[PDB]
Every structure is written in C-alpha cells, then in structure tokens.
Amino acid sequence: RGSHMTPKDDEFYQQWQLKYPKLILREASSVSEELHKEVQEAFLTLHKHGCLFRDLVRIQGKDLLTPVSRILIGNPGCTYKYLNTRLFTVPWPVKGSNIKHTEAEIAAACETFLKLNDYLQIETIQALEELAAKEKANDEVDIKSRAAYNVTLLNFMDPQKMPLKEEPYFGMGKMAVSWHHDENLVDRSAVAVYSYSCELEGRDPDIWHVGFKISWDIETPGLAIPLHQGDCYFMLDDLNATHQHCVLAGSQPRFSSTHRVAECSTGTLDYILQRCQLALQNVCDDVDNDDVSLKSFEPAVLKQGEEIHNEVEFEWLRQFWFQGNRYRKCTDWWCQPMAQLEALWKKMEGVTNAVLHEVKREGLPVEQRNEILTAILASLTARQNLRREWHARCQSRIARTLPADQKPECRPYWEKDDASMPLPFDLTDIVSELRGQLLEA
Ligand SMILES: O=C(O)CNC(=O)c1nc(Nc2ccc([N+](=O)[O-])cc2)ccc1O
Ligand SMILES: [Zn+2]
C-alpha cells in the first residue's frame, strides 16, 4: 500500500534530496524572536477583530463552505482569484501608497505582514540564488520577479471545531486542506509560508504537517513535514507545478501566512478601470444622463463593449458583493472603487439599451442588423446564464444560513418595476427575441 516519510525515517532525508529538492524548510531558529512576536500577535489581533472568514466557494458546480477561515492582505487594488472566488486585498502600507486604513489595530497587522513579506522575499531570493548555483555546478531579473510577493493569504482553522477528511493515498491521517496546487500564480513563482501552530508508526497526529507528493504519483512515498511555531517553508521554482501539497491537521488551532506572486494581469483595480474606460470611448461623454448615444455601431466595437460589460459585472461587482459586508469590517478601501465600478456598469447598461434600440431601427438594413446580433448574442447570453447562477448562489440553503454580516448580496439587483434602470434583470425575453431575429433571416 501507500506510505509517507517523516524525519523519523532514515530514507526521509535522501528522499527529500532526490525527489523534493526545490522544497526548502526554515525552522523558527532562523527567524528573530522580535519578528516572531510581532507576527504572532498580529495573527491574534486579526482573529480578535473577526477579520478571518470562511469562503462560500463553488467546486464542481457545488456550493461549499471552506473549513478554513481566511483573509487576503497585499498591495492596494490587487485581487487573487481562488476556487472561482475573487478575494480583494486588505491593503498594506506599500511605498508611496498611503491608505486611509482600517481600524488602528488592523492596520498594524497589515503593516506587520508587509514586514514579514519583506523578510520572506529576502530569504526566497537567497534560496533561489543557491538553487541556481547548484544547478550551474552540475537571468537575475527572473529571480527577483519570481520572489516579488504581492499578496499574502492568511488562514486559520481550529480542528476542535470541525466534526475531517482522511488523507487518501499515504495514510497521512486527517487533512485540513486536500491535495492541490496553488493556482493563479505567476509562472514558476515561489511561495513562502509562515506556520503558526498553537501550543507510533507514522506522523504525529497532534502536530501540524504539510504533505507533499508528485503529481499523478501515489507510488512514490509522500513527505509529511512537521510544522511548529514560527516554522517557514518555501516552494521554489517549479515545485508548485510538479508537486501537489496538502495540510495535515494537528490537535490545536494554527495560523498560516502564505505569500504568493499572484498573476494579476486581469486582476487589479487599475486594469479593470482601464477596461471600463475603453468601453466608454464608444459613448458621447458630454453629460452623464440617460440619453446614451453611441459613436459607432460597428459589430467589433459593440462586441468588445458588451464583453467588458460582463467582466465588470461578474468578475468584480458580483464577486465583491457575494462576500457581503466582509471587507467593511477590515477596511474601507474598496468602497469608493466599487461605487465607481458600479457607476461605470450602470452606464454600460444604457449602452446595451442603446445597442438594442439601434437594432430595432427602421432604416437599418437586415444586412447590418444581423451583423450587430452576431456580435452581441454570445455576450448577452452569458450575462443571462451568469445572472441566474449568481442569483441562485445568493439564495442557496448554505448561503441563507450564514451570519448576517457575511450574508451574500446579489448586487446589483432591481425588480422589473424599477424605472431607475433602462433594462430588466432578466434578459431571456430579449435573448429569445434576438435569437429569433437571426432565425427569420
Ligand atoms: O496553510 C498552509 O500552510 C498552506 N496553504 C495552502 O495550502 C493553501 N493554498 C491555497 N491555494 C490555492 C488553491 C486553489 C486555487 N484555485 O484557483 O483553484 C488557488 C490557490 C488555498 C488555500 C490554502 O490553505
Ligand atoms: Zn496551498
């Protein structure tokens, strides 16, 4: 059968060198006590203020509430999509980007994890330099970029509060997180983790461990790495892609800060605002009224506009409001941006209404009319399916049982009897009519 290796095994060390060499462990001895206290106190400060939340993710089309409470901290305006859920950063005091902040204690913790982020980056760079030197024996711009952590994901779980899955392949026992890869990260980027634990043939069940295995491979024995207070481990160059990792629950609670280079080419506030302004170039912008007039009705421009319409609504507005008043407990940073994004979105609703108005114009030849329909039919259809999915998710039995502050909100939403909106929430009657437009031709 399957098996795993711990420092109690003679083969454990040689197995580490020959099969998991890009995995680096740094014990609490290598971390200053002054930094140790600051980070651990920051963990409990965020826990005391209730800044850690369990997420209502969707996996394989099934609504699941994660056993691990978590929070995202990182650069202002940055996001990390994980398990189809876009987490928004609680900002930390990056250089020349001073924040109005959150509550005073919460701001200290974010600065603290920024300080921890700086230290882990330095260790990662040295580790990557040593890794490259060893390979050379047997560019430097890449090493800095692959260690340039932009966000950290904090997690907390109390095993005593959760009724746990057994590890299925190597008998590693109870799991807090199943085998997986850390996704949505820059290619070959390193991951640094700070483990904060609290207080026989096989691994110790009471001690927290991180598991490791090769992808597609349960014949190679896995590694169970015990984690104590202040232990740090690093997933170097391509370990995260070639190997899977899991978390093995101990007996006591445990915090962890996992620092990542999030891939955010389409996941920043600056990126999405620029996308919104690209869509609104097709609108006469003298005044912000309800008489939306479009500069061009070219199918290519219309298709790009309605795609951006979906991106801001579903990847940003509905993602943000599905988590409810979660960040308001932590920071007010995203309040104005989400108001601005919602304002930009409402104008695009007028654009769509303008596009539908032009389609039904009397002096528009069927040649040009069908062209517009072919350009926007896919975009409007997805907007219909996704609105149904998000509306259903906000009313699922699991969702209705959440705490009031974390209750999902299907925002934006408006009843059919609402005249403040140019278009209704349900588009099926429009979609069916538009589909029949191409059928009659
Ligand atoms: O706590 C520790 O010691 C180690 N932390 C982890 O293992 C850990 N990784 C995660 N990564 C991840 C998973 C799925 C996806 N996705 O897009 O699907 C993206 C990223 C998520 C939660 C986690 O607890
Ligand atoms: Zn992970």
Residue numbers in the entry: 27 to 164, 189 to 213, 215 to 250, 262 to 503
How does the study describe this entry?
The fat mass and obesity associated protein (FTO) is an Fe(II) and 2-oxoglutarate (2OG)-dependent oxygenase that catalyzes the oxidation of N-methyl groups in nucleic acids, and, in particular, of N6-methyladenosine (m6A) in RNA.1−3 FTO is a potential medicinal chemistry target due to its roles in obesity and cancer. Here, we report the use of structural knowledge of how FTO binds 2OG and substrate to design potent and, at least partially selective, FTO inhibitors.
We co-crystallized FTOΔ31 with 14a and determined its structure (2.6 Å resolution). The structure revealed that the hydroxypyridyl-glycine core of 14a binds, as observed for 4, in the 2OG binding site. 14a coordinates to the metal (Zn substituting for Fe) via its pyridinyl nitrogen and the carbonyl oxygen, its glycyl carboxylate forms a salt bridge with the side chain of Arg316 and hydrogen bonds with the side chains of Ser318 and Tyr295. The plane formed by the pyridinyl ring of 14a is skewed with respect to the plane formed by its pyridinyl nitrogen and carbonyl oxygen and the active site metal. With 14a, the nitrogen of the amine linker is positioned to potentially form a hydrogen bond with the Arg322 side chain (2.9 Å); the Arg322 side chain is also positioned to form a cation−π interaction with the pyridine ring of 14a. The p-nitrophenyl group of 14a is positioned between the Glu234 and Tyr108 side chains of FTO. Notably, the Glu234 side chain is displaced ∼5 Å by the p-nitrophenyl moiety toward the surface of the protein, an unprecedented observation in available FTO inhibitor structures.7,20,21,23−26,41 Glu234 is important as it has also been shown to interact with m6A in a structure of an FTO variant in complex with a ssDNA substrate.
